[PDB]
Amino acid sequence: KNIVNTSILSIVYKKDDLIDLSRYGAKINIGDRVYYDSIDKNQIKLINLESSTIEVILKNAIVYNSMYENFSTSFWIKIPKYFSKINLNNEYTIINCIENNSGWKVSLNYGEIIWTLQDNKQNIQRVVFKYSQMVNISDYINRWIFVTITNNRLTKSKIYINGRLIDQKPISNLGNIHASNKIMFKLDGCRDPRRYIMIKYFNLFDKELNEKEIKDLYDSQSNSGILKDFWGNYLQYDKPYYMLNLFDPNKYVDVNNIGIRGYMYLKGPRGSVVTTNIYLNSTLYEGTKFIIKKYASGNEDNIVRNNDRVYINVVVKNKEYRLATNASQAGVEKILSALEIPDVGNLSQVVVMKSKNKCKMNLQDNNGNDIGFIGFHLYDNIAKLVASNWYNRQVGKASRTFGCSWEFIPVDDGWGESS
């Protein structure tokens, strides 16, 4: 019943190959320089080499002249930060269904995801998503984005980003769009040899998806049982993460002293990384690193899941300490401390990991009672990290709750700031 089942092409990883999950069984030819993420094999990396290619041949049986009258494409994409002036004014095709100068393609440029419909009279229409590299904290740079492009020959071509309309151009003026049976995924025309993309869950639909169908597609493909890091990859155990509190993203976490008389606090503003005319962003690699440690998970995999019960380690001067509190302290607000792992004793330290990318951490006492979601509280102009059941009540008493949602930011090559 999810609209994704109606896909006429659904590229997924199985065994050691990409296959069409649709019942229409397209053929998929993979070049020698196509890579899969060791953790999430559906994450495909295409690099800037002629052998980094995925060729889809649709069955001629499903390819008909008027199929591109109503159609949508959906996929997820991770586009590394553009670092060089070579990247400016260099539109490069990534997904090509063009034959006899008619069809559709997806291209990228500096801060752009571009859709092109060409008819058989060579009239073109472009819809364009623009994202700035001149922002403190980008929702788009080097992060998994869900793209949905819908097309109705009587109305418009529309581009959606994470389920939200961004551009729309009327296409009623265009002629007939040639239906190729070939789709080529490959970097085409990119003058920067170090460029790559990552792509997952490519779908083609023989329909103009509506807003409500795009939202179900986005929500269904999110995998909300697995937590995500800032980039949108799987959250992992034993991996160091810089912390961001979504209520105040211009701050980072620091530790004031080790032990139960010490505390953790939000501090800012963030620094800045710059290449004039290319990017200006807040530094992400700032503050105390958190490491998620297995408590209730076995050594099956290192993936952190919804409702996993974990420990949190905190790195101070390349040494690990345990996030803990005394649940007995006066007041709802329990100030967190970084404790010597030997000393934690019976101090509350078990955290329930939850999805709302948007991670929550529910601290529990040693009887499995809630101490509360990890957030912060102002004590005389210091925003100290706390566990507070204030947050747990507010979730049930308000449409929204602010301050107990976090992002976990590991070092990533597509971001390229010094670690």
Residue numbers in the entry: 871 to 1226, 1233 to 1295
From the paper:
Botulinum neurotoxins (BoNT) are a group of clostridial toxins that cause the potentially fatal neuroparalytic disease botulism. BoNTs are composed of three domains—a cell-binding domain, a translocation domain, and a catalytic domain. For BoNT/A, the HC/A binds to both a ganglioside (e.g., GD1a) and synaptic vesicle protein 2 (SV2C) at the nerve terminals of the neuromuscular junction. In this paper, we present the crystal structures of the botulinum neurotoxin A2 cell binding domain, both alone and in complex with its receptor ganglioside GD1a at 1.63 and 2.10 Å, respectively.
The structure of HC/A2:GD1a complex was solved by molecular replacement to 2.1 Å with two molecules (A and B) in the asymmetric unit. Clear positive difference map electron density was observed at the GBS of molecule B that could be readily modelled as GD1a, whereas for molecule A, the GBS is inaccessible to GD1a due to crystal packing. Therefore, the HC/A2:GD1a asymmetric unit contains both the GD1a-bound and unbound states of HC/A2. A total of 5/6 monosaccharides are clearly defined by the electron density. GD1a forms a total of 10 hydrogen bonding interactions to HC/A2, two of which are water-mediated. The superimposition of molecule ‘A’ and ‘B’ (for Cα atoms) yields an RMSD of 0.47 Å, indicating that the overall structure of the molecule does not change upon binding GD1a. However, the loop spanning residues 1269–1277 appears to widen upon GD1a binding—the distance between the Cα atoms of residues 1269 and 1277 is ~4.5 Å greater in molecule B than that in molecule A. This change in loop positioning is accompanied by the rotation of Phe 1278 towards the GBS, a feature that has been observed previously in the HC/A3:GD1a, HC/A4:GD1a, and HC/A5:GM1b structures. Using DynDom (which estimates domain motions in proteins), the HCN/A2 subdomain appears to rotate 3.6° in one direction when bound to GD1a, but 6.7° in the other direction when bound to SV2C. In both the HC/A2 and HC/A2:GD1a structures, clear electron density was observed between Lys 1236 and Cys 1280 indicating the presence of an unusual covalent bridge between the two residues.
